[PDB]
Amino acid sequence: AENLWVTVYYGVPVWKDAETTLFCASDAKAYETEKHNVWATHACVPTDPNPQEIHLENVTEEFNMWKNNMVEQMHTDIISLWDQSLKPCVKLTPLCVTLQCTNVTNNITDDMRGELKNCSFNMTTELRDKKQKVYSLFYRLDVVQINSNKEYRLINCNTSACTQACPKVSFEPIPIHYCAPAGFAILKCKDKKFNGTGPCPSVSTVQCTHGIKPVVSTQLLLNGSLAEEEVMIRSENITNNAKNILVQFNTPVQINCTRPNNNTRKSIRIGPGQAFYATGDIIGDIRQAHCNVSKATWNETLGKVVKQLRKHFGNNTIIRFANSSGGDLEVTTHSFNCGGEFFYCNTSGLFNSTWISNNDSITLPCRIKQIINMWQRIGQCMYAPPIQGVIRCVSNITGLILTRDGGSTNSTTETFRPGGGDMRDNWRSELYKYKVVKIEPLGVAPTRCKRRV
Amino acid sequence: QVQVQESGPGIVKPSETLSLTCAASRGPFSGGHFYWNWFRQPPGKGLEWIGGIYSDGDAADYNPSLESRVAISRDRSANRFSLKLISVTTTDTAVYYCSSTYSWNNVWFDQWGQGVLVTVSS
Amino acid sequence: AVGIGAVFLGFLGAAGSTMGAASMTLTVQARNLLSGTVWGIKQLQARVLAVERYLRDQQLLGIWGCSGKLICCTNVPWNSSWSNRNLSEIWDNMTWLQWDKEISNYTQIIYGLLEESQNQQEKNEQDLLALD
Amino acid sequence: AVGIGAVFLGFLGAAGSTMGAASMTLTVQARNLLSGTVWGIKQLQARVLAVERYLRDQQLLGIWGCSGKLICCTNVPWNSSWSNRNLSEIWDNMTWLQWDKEISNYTQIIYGLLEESQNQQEKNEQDLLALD
Amino acid sequence: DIQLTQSPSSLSASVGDRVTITCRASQDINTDLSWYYQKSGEAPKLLIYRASNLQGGAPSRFSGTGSGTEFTLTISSLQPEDFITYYCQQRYSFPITFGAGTKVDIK
Amino acid sequence: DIQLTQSPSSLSASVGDRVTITCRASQDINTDLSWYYQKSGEAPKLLIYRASNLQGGAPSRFSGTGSGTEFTLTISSLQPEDFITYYCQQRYSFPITFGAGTKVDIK
Ligand SMILES: *[C@@H]1O[C@H](CO)[C@@H](O[C@@H]2O[C@H](CO)[C@@H](O[C@@H]3O[C@H](CO[C@H]4O[C@H](CO)[C@@H](O)[C@H](O)[C@@H]4O)[C@@H](O)[C@H](O[C@H]4O[C@H](CO)[C@@H](O)[C@H](O)[C@@H]4O[C@H]4O[C@H](CO)[C@@H](O)[C@H](O)[C@@H]4O)[C@@H]3O)[C@H](O)[C@H]2NC(C)=O)[C@H](O)[C@H]1NC(C)=O
Ligand SMILES: *[C@@H]1O[C@H](CO)[C@@H](O[C@@H]2O[C@H](CO)[C@@H](O[C@@H]3O[C@H](CO[C@H]4O[C@H](CO)[C@@H](O)[C@H](O)[C@@H]4O)[C@@H](O)[C@H](O[C@H]4O[C@H](CO)[C@@H](O)[C@H](O)[C@@H]4O)[C@@H]3O)[C@H](O)[C@H]2NC(C)=O)[C@H](O)[C@H]1NC(C)=O
Ligand SMILES: *[C@@H]1O[C@H](CO)[C@@H](O[C@@H]2O[C@H](CO)[C@@H](O[C@@H]3O[C@H](CO)[C@@H](O)[C@H](O[C@H]4O[C@H](CO)[C@@H](O)[C@H](O)[C@@H]4O)[C@@H]3O)[C@H](O)[C@H]2NC(C)=O)[C@H](O)[C@H]1NC(C)=O
Ligand SMILES: *[C@@H]1O[C@H](CO)[C@@H](O[C@@H]2O[C@H](CO)[C@@H](O[C@@H]3O[C@H](CO)[C@@H](O)[C@H](O)[C@@H]3O)[C@H](O)[C@H]2NC(C)=O)[C@H](O)[C@H]1NC(C)=O
Ligand SMILES: *[C@@H]1O[C@H](CO)[C@@H](O[C@@H]2O[C@H](CO)[C@@H](O[C@@H]3O[C@H](CO)[C@@H](O)[C@H](O)[C@@H]3O)[C@H](O)[C@H]2NC(C)=O)[C@H](O)[C@H]1NC(C)=O
Ligand SMILES: *[C@@H]1O[C@H](CO)[C@@H](O[C@@H]2O[C@H](CO)[C@@H](O[C@@H]3O[C@H](CO)[C@@H](O)[C@H](O)[C@@H]3O)[C@H](O)[C@H]2NC(C)=O)[C@H](O)[C@H]1NC(C)=O
Ligand SMILES: *[C@@H]1O[C@H](CO)[C@@H](O[C@@H]2O[C@H](CO)[C@@H](O[C@@H]3O[C@H](CO)[C@@H](O)[C@H](O)[C@@H]3O)[C@H](O)[C@H]2NC(C)=O)[C@H](O)[C@H]1NC(C)=O
Ligand SMILES: *[C@@H]1O[C@H](CO)[C@@H](O[C@@H]2O[C@H](CO)[C@@H](O[C@@H]3O[C@H](CO)[C@@H](O)[C@H](O)[C@@H]3O)[C@H](O)[C@H]2NC(C)=O)[C@H](O)[C@H]1NC(C)=O
Ligand SMILES: *[C@@H]1O[C@H](CO)[C@@H](O[C@@H]2O[C@H](CO)[C@@H](O[C@@H]3O[C@H](CO)[C@@H](O)[C@H](O)[C@@H]3O)[C@H](O)[C@H]2NC(C)=O)[C@H](O)[C@H]1NC(C)=O
Ligand SMILES: *[C@@H]1O[C@H](CO)[C@@H](O[C@@H]2O[C@H](CO)[C@@H](O[C@@H]3O[C@H](CO)[C@@H](O)[C@H](O)[C@@H]3O)[C@H](O)[C@H]2NC(C)=O)[C@H](O)[C@H]1NC(C)=O
Ligand SMILES: *[C@@H]1O[C@H](CO)[C@@H](O[C@@H]2O[C@H](CO)[C@@H](O[C@@H]3O[C@H](CO)[C@@H](O)[C@H](O)[C@@H]3O)[C@H](O)[C@H]2NC(C)=O)[C@H](O)[C@H]1NC(C)=O
Ligand SMILES: *[C@@H]1O[C@H](CO)[C@@H](O[C@@H]2O[C@H](CO)[C@@H](O)[C@H](O)[C@H]2NC(C)=O)[C@H](O)[C@H]1NC(C)=O
Ligand SMILES: *[C@@H]1O[C@H](CO)[C@@H](O[C@@H]2O[C@H](CO)[C@@H](O)[C@H](O)[C@H]2NC(C)=O)[C@H](O)[C@H]1NC(C)=O
Ligand SMILES: *[C@@H]1O[C@H](CO)[C@@H](O)[C@H](O)[C@H]1NC(C)=O
Ligand SMILES: *[C@@H]1O[C@H](CO)[C@@H](O)[C@H](O)[C@H]1NC(C)=O
Ligand SMILES: *[C@@H]1O[C@H](CO)[C@@H](O)[C@H](O)[C@H]1NC(C)=O
Ligand SMILES: *[C@@H]1O[C@H](CO)[C@@H](O)[C@H](O)[C@H]1NC(C)=O
Ligand SMILES: *[C@@H]1O[C@H](CO)[C@@H](O)[C@H](O)[C@H]1NC(C)=O
Ligand SMILES: *[C@@H]1O[C@H](CO)[C@@H](O)[C@H](O)[C@H]1NC(C)=O
């Protein structure tokens, strides 16, 4: 009995952690028509209904979202998909040429003085012998002066030439799902107060994550998830001043953006099978596009956020909000996309308040841009064709990104400013409750039994 | 092999509110849809039904007898559930049991309980 | 009907019990291994990886002379130099992960002994059958 | 400790000994068959071909009813036509490579005999177990 | 809703005898019923699952048959521990009705 | 150097007697030790390896035990072949040392 011999088992439930390539999965509903869109191509296998969830008990596991994989992976995938979609479209090389430009005095309000320019130039036709004279309109933030007479040139001409966007394509995001192949498992921590790093006792396993909607924004987050208990704050090392802070809300807030102006369209021929789209004529009075939010909602939400934040820097402290410090036009202002357009809104009127110890609507203006270089790359620009008719969309605000400014001694006061700029954090705000593990079926143990001859 | 227990106060007085709680363990099986039922044994009869509830949702289905007084809630934190009764009266003289049911491969075990005296008198 | 639900036995979720109870439920896991332009290339890599992983385990089980079963005995004698404790505690209060981290260092030798043991067994049996 | 190195028993280097010794070291060689944008395709093809080869010879061994074992006897008698010789010289002096070269002509003839022998044997014993 | 009738409603069956208990529903319930057995000092338990089907693990001493609104359970012998109350319960649309309770006494 | 003491220096006993020999170290060496046996005219060989592992081919009557600075060899039943000399050798850091040597005699 005391003496014993080794024994072998198979299919033992033990696992470790590693990394591997994931794959996609899309709802069949999207497969129903809608053949034109940057994402949501048909290669994704159709999903399956009635997902199942298995509960575990007596387990405890450590999570660390800061040093997490499968973030850069989907970042790279998104960039590659964008580049692939953009490939087959006409080029825009011949437009680099001197222009003759003037103002536009058509009952413009005083705030728009010099914000539209009427320009004309020469351009070759299909037959290489002839040339023709054409004209168009432009915004101030796309043309530059060089040196009486008046002349102007494009802004990207000396840097690079880039492709005009194809006409029929859709930028609307849709839900997507991530799934792992056989021989791997995906674990989720269901604790409703887990602060993003450390132990977690309540765990479960799944095969495919819930829906995800890729969105591009800065200084805010739109159409995210909603917490369940209260506003939560997350960070790597809150004591350090060089790391951003993510704030996730408990309830949503509503926002309305609109461009009341009206536009038409026109087409021009450049060469064999080469078309070009240009702005037409305006019909009536013109006004600046703008956005609205409520007042009381914002007030109470800020109050709750301050109250929650107070639990780290002592109750005897002062808080002051300040606008963006300053810099280039891409981080200093909140940029977003709605209906195939790009706005740039000045958020000076939202972080202007102070807090000490113990039906009106806020309206803000925006501006329009037509040449874009996103993902902070160089040598790759785009052209956005104009659209006809007014536009208006509505969305939800769900999260904020803040950065604490430096201080001196204990001045019983602190300041925060909006930050951001890197799109990694936007992905990181979602995939902080998922881990990937690998199985190890073999096993060995001693046993009193002995093999028979 | 699940073990289910109940508790409660002494002899409550009529015109007051009674409360009770029950705890059950998932035990051997990993994932399922355990169902819970509440019953009482008044003297001189058989069993009387006091409703039931699933283990996945707080929605409670009651019984025809006293629907304006019953209040059943599910405690997700500890896999528990509470049964409360307003306008208590001496008519509630009984021994209360807390039962649960699986559906294990067409066997349908049950672990009815042990009982607890919940009589009412001033 | 009105109270009858469904209670199945799922994927790996018994990893919170003693060293012994878990072994009663193993078969299920064994039956879940071979389940079956840049946006679609990686699937081929995944499939190749999966099949290679399965084949490696099949071969390794084949060599040790225990293929076709889930519980197999052998002849190599255990040595207390590798580990301590007695049968009671080991099979009453422990978890598979704890054992894994316990025996991590001394694995290659334990693997190695089995094949030479099997080779001696086979060689002796061959002559036992061939002598007549 | 100090003053002791490390000895292994590696790859094909044992392929110059006599008939007898080499068959001791079979297992290791058998273990070394499944080791693990235009460059990926060719290596993927190579891996696929290796897996296919392994599956092919595994199946071929399986047909002859000797699966899971490194040695297996069979009923087909040995005709003296192919090479008379005698047991002592073949099992003492001849090496593997020269033997393979010298019996390289009559492989296909040999395979069919094993196949049919197994088929007939299984068919015969089926009736015996059927009448049971 | 649905009402049932159990017979013998009050029988003091002498120990060591074959005893039969009949339960008849009011309206047809197809085949949806179960039988339970209970005694004081403990809680109720199940003796027959599905009625027509025999409960898994129940003693072979008890057997059951029936259909519709008529079912009958036969016990090959009355054990000392079998002097208990039996209930036929319909597993059909709401509400849920239980057996009247046929206590088996000693004589 | 690491001094190793063998006890007894010499011994005389009849055949079949149960006997013990001890090797003590100057300082702690853990269990990097071994025991060799020799007779005059024949090359020495290792009888016991590591003081815990039985060398292949040796009779089971020999047993080795101990650790640290104390190690023991026990013969349950002496034999005529067991009347030989023994040496405890240390496979530790340099240099290398050997025991004084103990002899077994027939009385
Ligand atoms: C965060 O989440 C919020 C909430 O979901 C989201 O706001 C919603 O965004 C979606 C997607 O853009 C909005 O849906 C769009 O709504 C308008 C109008 O379409 C609606 O109304 C018309 C008229 O009743 C209906 O026919 C239509 O089915 C919709 O109900 C447009 O932006 C889009 O509609 C297209 O189709 C209409 C069909 O009539 C056209 O009239 C319209 O011009 C649009 O173009 C279509 O035709 C073009 C050819 O002429 C073609 O090129 C286009 O591809 C397209 O087919 C679209 O339905 C929804 O209304 C928003 N909800 C609210 C309350 O405002 C936010 O967008 C999201 N955040 C971000 C940053 O995206
Ligand atoms: C942005 O810059 C562009 C640069 O091209 C300007 O475009 C030109 O603007 C002028 C002035 O509005 C346009 O002239 C208009 O042309 C149309 C047809 O008139 C033509 O034919 C008549 C008869 O032969 C000529 O007299 C006339 O000069 C034109 O050649 C009509 O829209 C207008 O005609 C009206 O006035 C004329 C008298 O001037 C009358 O004879 C007509 O009956 C009628 O009442 C007007 O003359 C010119 O065509 C535009 N060129 C192009 C290529 O479009 C934009 O005006 C400037 N500002 C914007 C867009 O706001
Ligand atoms: C931006 O914020 C607004 C305000 O909160 C938000 O509107 C809310 O949306 C949620 C989520 O869609 C709604 O809650 C659930 O949503 C769906 C609706 O089908 C269901 O999960 C739930 O509905 C149940 O009841 C319906 C009865 O008609 C059934 O059809 C359905 O099957 C479910 O049983 C549930 O409503 C929430 O009600 C609205 N609130 C409103 C309109 O006041 C909006 O969705 C946010 N934006 C985005 C993009 O999410
Ligand atoms: C499109 O190309 C045509 C043809 O080159 C340009 O018209 C020409 O512009 C030049 C430069 O201004 C003019 O040169 C000089 O103009 C004056 C006229 O009094 C005088 O100094 C000389 O006679 C000399 O020609 C030229 O006249 C003019 N030609 C014509 C036929 O009008 C035109 O400017 C280009 N348009 C655009 C929008 O780039
Ligand atoms: C998180 O941020 C805090 C600061 O907000 C870091 O605390 C400080 O970290 C520094 C750098 O590692 C430590 O080094 C040195 O300590 C002494 C005393 O201050 C002095 O030589 C230097 O000024 C320097 O700071 C320091 O001890 C430590 N504590 C304090 C009070 O400054 C912290 O390390 C950051 N991250 C982590 C993971 O802890
Ligand atoms: C964001 O809020 C601003 C400020 O309230 C809104 O502007 C206001 O919008 C209303 C409703 O369209 C305008 O009323 C209109 O005025 C004239 C008559 O005076 C006429 O166009 C209509 O009959 C209507 O009454 C109002 O003038 C306008 N300005 C102000 C200062 O209130 C804006 O519409 C809001 N944006 C969105 C997208 O809701
Ligand atoms: C952003 O635009 C939305 C959509 O117009 C605005 O919400 C809408 O506000 C109007 C005016 O109050 C609501 O219409 C009427 O109001 C009351 C209920 O508030 C009631 O008499 C009727 O039901 C009627 O609809 C309209 O319901 C409401 N839209 C909803 C609830 O979907 C919103 O106010 C705008 N944002 C801001 C900050 O003003
Ligand atoms: C964030 O907030 C600060 C503080 O409000 C903004 O600073 C503002 O910067 C502009 C541009 O320099 C200042 O305009 C200046 O006004 C007077 C006119 O006599 C004079 O100093 C200069 O000629 C210049 O025009 C503006 O006054 C200043 N605001 C304040 C309150 O001092 C900053 O621009 C804001 N940043 C963003 C990105 O919105
Ligand atoms: C974002 O919008 C805010 C809205 O307040 C702008 O802040 C305002 O900016 C002006 C200068 O543009 C500040 O100065 C005022 O304007 C002129 C020149 O300075 C003059 O009339 C006055 O002396 C006055 O200072 C103005 O104070 C400031 N508003 C507040 C409440 O401080 C801000 O400039 C906008 N940011 C960008 C980048 O456009
Ligand atoms: C950021 O918050 C500050 C503090 O509330 C705002 O400054 C305040 O702005 C209003 C509107 O311009 C000032 O009212 C002005 O006061 C005097 C007369 O008392 C005169 O300049 C004007 O007739 C007007 O009524 C108010 O005094 C001023 N408060 C200060 C400086 O303490 C600021 O406008 C906010 N920024 C934004 C973009 O909303
Ligand atoms: C932006 O401006 C354009 C140009 O003014 C607007 O299009 C115009 O929409 C009106 C809507 O009543 C059209 O009127 C009717 O159109 C048809 C014939 O096209 C017919 O039913 C009637 O005879 C009447 O004219 C008008 O034709 C149309 N104009 C053009 C040039 O297409 C457009 O509606 C404006 N967008 C918004 C959002 O208001
Ligand atoms: C037309 O646009 C030009 C710029 O292209 C305007 O020129 C400037 O206008 C501002 C605002 O009135 C003045 O302060 C500047 O002095 C003007 N000159 C420069 C060099 O910036 C011009 O005012 C606009 N209007 C007209 C009628 O030409
Ligand atoms: C998130 O919670 C963790 C766990 O409480 C916090 O980090 C812990 O800090 C304590 C005190 O220094 C250490 O003893 C623990 O070892 C830390 N655990 C981990 C997992 O880091 C962490 O600070 C919290 N984060 C924020 C932003 O508040
Ligand atoms: C968890 O641990 C407890 C205490 O040892 C044990 O009784 C139970 O069976 C374990 N497993 C569970 C609750 O699944
Ligand atoms: C500008 O105002 C004039 C004078 O009222 C009017 O005739 C003309 O149509 C207006 N133009 C636009 C584009 O609103
Ligand atoms: C916000 O609400 C508080 C009370 O919670 C009130 O004192 C204050 O005036 C409101 N407005 C702002 C801008 O804080
Ligand atoms: C803030 O007040 C809370 C009230 O619960 C107290 O616990 C905490 O110590 C206080 N912190 C300070 C004064 O920094
Ligand atoms: C196992 O050994 C431990 C430690 O000495 C002891 O407490 C326990 O009783 C032993 N159990 C047995 C021999 O079953
Ligand atoms: C094998 O046969 C050869 C050739 O006849 C002969 O020389 C040799 O001795 C034989 N060896 C045996 C019988 O072992």
**What would the DSSP string read from start to end of chain E?**
---EEEESSSB-PPSSS-EEEEEEESS--SS-EEEEEE-TTS--EEEESSSSSPPTT--TTEEEEEETTEEEEEESS--GGG-SEEEEEE-SSSS------EEB---
Cα(B87) to centroid(ligand 14), Å: 40
- Residue A166 burial (C-beta neighbours within 10 Å; 0-12, 13-18, 19+): middle
CB F89 within 8 A of CB F32: no
CB A444 within 8 A of CB A5: no
Q: Which residue of D has its CA nearest to F30?
A: D1
Q: Where are the beta strands (DSSP E) in chain F?
A: 4-7, 10-12, 19-25, 33-38, 45-49, 53-54, 62-67, 70-75, 85-90, 102-105
Intra-chain end-to-end CA distance of chain A, in Å: 19
Q: Tokens 């013990």 — which residue?
A: F20
Q: Residues for chain B: how many in total?
A: 122
Q: Tokens 């093809």 — which residue?
A: D45
**Min distance C21 CA to chain A CA atoms (Å):** 12
Contacts of A333 (CB under 8 A, 6+ apart): A219, A324, A344, A345, A346, A347
Among A240, A250, A228, smallest CA distance to A305 is for A250
CB B95 within 8 A of CB B118: yes
The answer to whether the CB atoms of A58 and C96 lie below 8 A apart is no
Half-sphere exposure of A59 (CA within 13 A, CB side): 23
Among F3, F4, F1, F8, smallest CA distance to F73 is for F8
From the CA of A121, the nearest ligand is: 4
Which residue has the CA at smallest separation from atom 55 of ligand 2?
A: A118
- Residue B39 burial (C-beta neighbours within 10 Å; 0-12, 13-18, 19+): buried
CA A48 to chain centre: 28
Q: Which amino acid, one-letter code, is at B101?
A: T
Q: Tokens 């002559």 — which residue?
A: C127
Q: Quote the CA–CA distance of C32 and C36 in Å, as a whole number.
A: 10
Instruction: Inform me whether the C-beta atom of residue C73 falls under 8 Å from chain B C-beta atoms.
Output: no
Instruction: Inform me whether the C-beta atom of residue C73 falls under 8 Å from chain E C-beta atoms.
Output: no
Residues of chain D with C-beta less than 8 angstroms from the C-beta of C48: 44, 47-48
Q: Tokens 């025809």 — which residue?
A: B64
The answer to whether the CB atoms of E98 and B108 lie below 8 A apart is no
Q: Which residue of B has its CA nearest to C6?
A: B103
- Residue B2 burial (C-beta neighbours within 10 Å; 0-12, 13-18, 19+): middle
- Residue F87 burial (C-beta neighbours within 10 Å; 0-12, 13-18, 19+): buried
Q: Which amino acid, one-letter code, is at A290?
A: H
Neighbours of E1 (CB within 10 A): 12
The answer to whether the CB atoms of D4 and F91 lie below 8 A apart is yes
Instruction: Inform me whether the C-beta atom of residue A87 falls under 8 Å from chain C C-beta atoms.
Output: no
Q: Quote the CA–CA distance of E38 and E56 in Å, as a whole number.
A: 18
Contacts of A427 (CB under 8 A, 6+ apart): A71, A74, A75
Dihedral sign computed on CA atoms, order A190, A193, A198, A202: negative
Resolution of the PDB structure in angstroms:
3.8
Instruction: Inform me whether the C-beta atom of residue C44 falls under 8 Å from chain B C-beta atoms.
Output: no
Cα(A114) to centroid(ligand 12), Å: 7
- CA B46 vs CA A113, B42, B92, D94, F38: distances in Å: 90, 7, 14, 93, 91
Q: Residues for chain C: how many in total?
A: 132
Q: Quote the CA–CA distance of A45 and A33 in Å, as a whole number.
A: 16
The answer to whether the CB atoms of E43 and B99 lie below 8 A apart is yes
SS3 assignment, position C127: helix
The shortest CB-CB distance from D27 to any of C51, C52, C115 is to C115
**Min distance A49 CA to chain B CA atoms (Å):** 18
From the CA of D88, the nearest ligand is: 19
Q: What are the residues facing F34 on neighbouring strands? A: F49, F89
Contacts of D70 (CB under 8 A, 6+ apart): C122, D26, D27, D30
Among C10, C9, C21, C12, smallest CA distance to C95 is for C21
Residues of chain C with C-beta less than 8 angstroms from the C-beta of A7: 71-74
Which residue has the CA at smallest separation from atom 4 of ligand 13?
A: A198
Q: Which residue of C has its CA nearest to E32?
A: C1
CB A281 near ligand 15, within 6 Å? no
The shortest CB-CB distance from C63 to any of D31, D44, D48 is to D31
Tally DSSP H helices, then E strands, for chain B: 0, 10
Q: Quote the CA–CA distance of D95 and D70 in Å, as a whole number.
A: 20
Interface test with C, best of E29, E34, E91 (most C CBs within 10 A): E91
Q: Quote the CA–CA distance of A341 and A323 in Å, as a whole number.
A: 25
The residue to mutate among A253, A254, A301, having the most atoms of ligand 7 within 8 angstroms of its beta carbon, is: A254
CB C90 within 8 A of CB A7: no
Task: Supply C61's token pair.
Answer: 């089980």
- B-proximal residues of A, 41-100, CB under 8 Å: 53-57
User: Are chains A and C in contact at 3+ CB pairs closer than 8 Å?
Assistant: yes
B:C CB pairs within 8 Å:
36
Which chains reach chain A with 3 or more Cβ–Cβ distances below 8 angstroms? Answer: B, C
**Min distance D68 CA to chain C CA atoms (Å):** 6
Interface test with B, best of C2, C7, C11 (most B CBs within 10 A): C7
The answer to whether the CB atoms of B31 and C13 lie below 8 A apart is yes
Question: Which residues have C-beta atoms less than 6 Å from ligand 17?
Answer: A 314-316
CB A254 within 8 A of CB A294: yes
Cα(A88) to centroid(ligand 1), Å: 26
CB A268 within 8 A of CB A123: yes
**Min distance C123 CA to chain D CA atoms (Å):** 9
**Taking the domains of chain D in order of start, what are their residue ranges?**
9-132
Intra-chain end-to-end CA distance of chain E, in Å: 36
Cα(A386) to centroid(ligand 12), Å: 26
Task: Supply B72's token pair.
Answer: 């059943």
Cα(A346) to centroid(ligand 8), Å: 13
Cα(A362) to centroid(ligand 10), Å: 15
Cα(A262) to centroid(ligand 1), Å: 18
Question: Which residues have C-beta atoms less than 6 Å from ligand 13?
Answer: A 195, 197-198, 234-235, 238
From the CA of A367, the nearest ligand is: 9
The answer to whether the CB atoms of D70 and C115 lie below 8 A apart is no
CB A167 near ligand 1, within 6 Å? no
Task: Supply A368's token pair.
Answer: 């329009």
Among C77, C65, C79, smallest CA distance to C118 is for C65
CB A303 near ligand 16, within 6 Å? yes
Q: Quote the CA–CA distance of F101 and F44 in Å, as a whole number.
A: 12
From the CA of D87, the nearest ligand is: 19
Angle made by CA atoms A112, A118, A121, in degrees to the nearest 5: 155
Dihedral sign computed on CA atoms, order A362, A367, A368, A372: negative
CB E90 within 8 A of CB E31: no
Instruction: Inform me whether the C-beta atom of residue C5 falls under 8 Å from chain E C-beta atoms.
Output: no
